[PDB]
Structure formats: structure tokens, C-alpha cells
């Protein structure tokens, strides 16, 4: 009972693109781009598709940087999230129905208005380390348990 999702971070040398989620799950937080993988597409295709849909951007290349499993108390399906990052964007980001994009300098990442797991694994992403994580949440605000480690192969 796991379900595949994607998370894409646009990471340039001095800044990162995040999206203010307007509707639904994680609304009011600055999020990476992504969502559910569909039937008939690879995990990487799903990542490119969601990034395009949410921000208008396409990219030259995506790099797999991590995998995180989320469990929510009361929810039968685990979320199995494949995390990608990219520097090679094509186009300029624009607002979608779902998300309002905005750049943040790496020393002004708005951690207090992000999912609380981001405080744990973002540093690993910023150091170009590959990682495996697990987070158990109670609702959207409380982490009950977690594990996190560096890997060679994502
Ligand atoms: C579902 S738990 C979760 N953590 C996240 N961090 C950053 N961006 C997201 N969309 C995230 N979702």
C-alpha cells in the first residue's frame, strides 16, 4: 500500500524555486513541485509533467537526489516520494491554478512556512548528498518518528 509521487526542486547556485500551494493538500506552504505518478508514464516523465503543469517550466535534465516515504496516521496508502533536482531550466516560471512560484536565496529559505520534514532533508539536498528518508506524521503539522540517511544509490 504505497503510491508513487514526485518532488522536483529547481536549484540554482544562489537560489531555489518554490511554489506557494493555493488549494488542497499542503496549502499555505511553500512546496517543491510534483504530485502523483500516472499509469503509462515513468517516474521521471511524471516529474517533468508536474513541473510543466505547475510552473510552466520544462527542463533539459533531472537528477534523482532522494527517496522519502511518508506515513500519515489513519491513512492506508504510504506516499513513496522520488526527489529530483535541476539547474537547467528552460523558460520563465509562471503561476498556475495550483501554485504561485517564487525564487528564494539559499540563506532565506522560508522553513517556517514549509512542510516540517524539509528542515531535515533540505540541508542534504543543498550539500549534493543523496538520501533515503522516512517520516511518520500525525496530520499535517506533527512528525512522530523519522529516519534519515545518506546513500550511494538513490
Ligand atoms: C507530503 S510531505 C511533503 N514534504 C514536502 N516538502 C516539500 N514539498 C512538498 N510538496 C512536500 N510534501
UniProtKB/Swiss-Prot annotation:
Segments forming domain Nudix hydrolase: 1-130
One cellular-component annotation, GO: nucleus
Binding-site list for 8-oxo-ATP: 25, 33-36, 50, 54, 115-118
GO biological process, one term: DNA repair
Segments carrying motif Nudix box: 35-56
Binding site for 2-oxo-dATP: 6, 31, 33-36, 115-118
Catalytic activity: 2-oxo-dATP + H2O = 2-oxo-dAMP + diphosphate + H(+); 2-oxo-ATP + H2O = 2-oxo-AMP + diphosphate + H(+); 8-oxo-dGTP + H2O = 8-oxo-dGMP + diphosphate + H(+); 8-oxo-dATP + H2O = 8-oxo-dAMP + diphosphate + H(+)
Function: Oxidized purine nucleoside triphosphate hydrolase which is a prominent sanitizer of the oxidized nucleotide pool. Catalyzes the hydrolysis of 2-oxo-dATP (2-hydroxy-dATP) into 2-oxo-dAMP. Also has a significant hydrolase activity toward 2-oxo-ATP, 8-oxo-dGTP and 8-oxo-dATP. Through the hydrolysis of oxidized purine nucleoside triphosphates, prevents their incorporation into DNA and the subsequent transversions A:T to C:G and G:C to T:A. Also catalyzes the hydrolysis of methylated purine nucleoside triphosphate preventing their integration into DNA.
Cofactor list: Mg(2+)
Result of altering residue 52 to P: Loss of activity
Protein name: Oxidized purine nucleoside triphosphate hydrolase
Binding site for O(6)-methyl-dGMP: 6, 21, 31, 115-118
GO terms of molecular function: 2-hydroxy-ATP hydrolase activity; 2-hydroxy-dATP hydrolase activity; 8-oxo-7,8-dihydrodeoxyguanosine triphosphate pyrophosphatase activity; 8-oxo-7,8-dihydroguanosine triphosphate pyrophosphatase activity; ATP diphosphatase activity; dATP diphosphatase activity; hydrolase activity, acting on acid anhydrides, in phosphorus-containing anhydrides; metal ion binding
pH dependence, record text: Optimum pH is 7.8-8.2 with 8-oxo-dGTP as substrate, and 8.0-8.5 with 2-oxo-dATP as substrate.
UniProt-reported outcome of changing residue 38 to P: Reduces activity by 97%
Amino acid at each position: 500500500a504505497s503510491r508513487l509521487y514526485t518532488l522536483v526542486l529547481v536549484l540554482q547556485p544562489q537560489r531555489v524555486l518554490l511554489g506557494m500551494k493555493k488549494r488542497g493538500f499542503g496549502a499555505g506552504r511553500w512546496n517543491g513541485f510534483g504530485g502523483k505518478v500516472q499509469e503509462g508514464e515513468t517516474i521521471e516523465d511524471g516529474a517533468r509533467r508536474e513541473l510543466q503543469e505547475e510552473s510552466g517550466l520544462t527542463v533539459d535534465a533531472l537528477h534523482k537526489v532522494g527517496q522519502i516515504v511518508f506515513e500519515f496516521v489513519g491513512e492506508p496508502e504510504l506516499m513513496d516520494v522520488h526527489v529530483f533536482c535541476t539547474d537547467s531550466i528552460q523558460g520563465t516560471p509562471v503561476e498556475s491554478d495550483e501554485m504561485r512560484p517564487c525564487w528564494f536565496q539559499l540563506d532565506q529559505i522560508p522553513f517556517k512556512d514549509m512542510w516540517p520534514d524539509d528542515s531535515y532533508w533540505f540541508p542534504l539536498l543543498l550539500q549534493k548528498k543523496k538520501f533515503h528518508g522516512y517520516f511518520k506524521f500525525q496530520g499535517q503539522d506533527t512528525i512522530l518518528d523519522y529516519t534519515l540517511r545518506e546513500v550511494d544509490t538513490v
